[PDB]
Design a protein around this nucleic acid. Structure first.
Ligand SMILES: Cc1cn([C@H]2C[C@H](O)[C@@H](COP(=O)(O)O)O2)c(=O)[nH]c1=O
Ligand SMILES: [Ca+2]
Ligand SMILES: [K+]
Ligand SMILES: [K+]
Ligand code: NA
Ligand code: NA
Length: 320
DNA sequence: GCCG
DNA sequence: CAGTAC
DNA sequence: CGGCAGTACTG
């Protein structure tokens, strides 16, 4: 909380490495930023920095250069392309490779992209909602969106469970988007639901754009009725009842939380996914899986933590 | 970038 | 497959 | 040295 003197400047570098494609270096920065964001005291000494898991020599040296100087020299040598690459990769469906290609082609503005760029179907939808998708909504709107999906789903089968996950479920005041997880306790009635449900939501004009339409994941765009409404990203994921706890866990996040849980499971010979916690997973020397293992029974999220030797954590306690 |  | 996002 | 989470979709 109190190290913003440092994190604020480190975040500029992390983002700069991210948009330029240097994904693992940006992962290092992102981790050290989360570490700093959860210490107890403001870091004041080189040796006090290296004590924190995720902060090494190079990162500690920058941490001191900020206290001795208030500024970090690296920030003055960030490529002039970075603001433009960030602009381009804030389009949904465009990442670092697409942004770098557009930059190499001489594009510098969203007007350039609009008029001259080659765009996928997803990216054109991303661009059309560029401003709207950079906004977080108040959680009260997220409730309305979840309620709209629930009511349409439960109209086909009142046995369907519907749970909004993500930052909503972690109790945040604003939500970048809404993910509604859908299952059925009977273990089979969840099947074949999309075609009807999405049609129901489509007929009223609530769904405005589809980005992904898979057998289990729908990603798209919605807008509530009336004036004053913005387009929002909506996900609907339909899973079998036995995978519900692992799905709830993944889709609730946070992303850094999921990755640290999965990294932990790997060290214990296990494998954790949005489908299941698996055991006796056989892997090779590069950490790649070769043998699948056995699915462990996880009727609730508490079981996942227990099977991993961890104290449970409420959704609100999973920011990192 | 960090860490085993 | 590579790219992207969940 | 070398992995850093695991998977679903798209074209
Ligand atoms: C962005 C992101 C999300 N997630 C998970 C955690 C998020 O709560 C969940 C839904 O993503 P979203 O909130 O961006 O729709 O997906 C990852 O596992 N990895 C990622 O890189
Ligand atoms: Ca979220
Ligand atoms: K450390
Ligand atoms: K265009
Ligand atoms: Na993007
Ligand atoms: Na979403």
């Amino acid at each position: 909380n109190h190290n913003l003197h440092i994190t604020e400047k480190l975040e500029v570098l992390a983002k700069a490495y991210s948009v330029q494609g240097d994904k693992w270096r940006a992962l290092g920065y992102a981790k050290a930023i989360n570490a700093l964001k959860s210490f107890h005291k403001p870091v004041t000494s080189y040796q006090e920095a290296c004590s924190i898991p995720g902060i090494g020599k190079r990162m500690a040296e920058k941490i001191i250069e900020i206290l001795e100087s208030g500024h970090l020299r690296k920030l003055d040598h960030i490529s002039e392309s970075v603001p433009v690459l960030e602009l381009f990769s804030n389009i949904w469906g465009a990442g670092t490779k697409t942004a770098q290609m557009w930059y190499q082609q001489g594009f510098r503005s969203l007007e350039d992209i609009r008029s001259q760029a080659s765009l996928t179907t997803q990216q054109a939808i991303g661009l059309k909602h560029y401003s709207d998708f950079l906004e977080r909504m108040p959680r009260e709107e997220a409730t309305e969106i979840e309620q709209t999906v629930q009511k349409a789903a439960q109209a086909f089968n009142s046995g369907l469970l519907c749970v909004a996950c993500g930052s909503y479920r972690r109790g945040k005041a604003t939500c970048g988007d809404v993910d509604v997880l859908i299952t059925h306790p009977d273990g089979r009635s969840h099947r074949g639901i999309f075609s009807r449900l999405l049609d129901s939501l489509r007929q009223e004009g609530f769904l405005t754009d589809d980005l992904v339409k898979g057998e289990t994941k729908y990603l798209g765009v919605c807008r509530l009725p009336g004036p004053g409404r913005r387009h929002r990203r909506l996900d609907i994921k339909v899973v079998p009842y036995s995978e519900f706890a692992c799905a709830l866990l993944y889709f609730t996040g946070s992303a850094h939380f999921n990755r640290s849980m999965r990294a932990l499971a790997k060290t214990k010979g296990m494998s954790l996914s949005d489908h299941a916690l698996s055991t006796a997973v056989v892997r090779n020397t590069h950490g790649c899986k070769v043998g699948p293992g056995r699915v462990l029974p996880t009727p609730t999220e508490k079981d996942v933590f227990r099977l991993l030797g961890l104290p449970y954590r409420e959704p609100a306690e999973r920011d990192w």
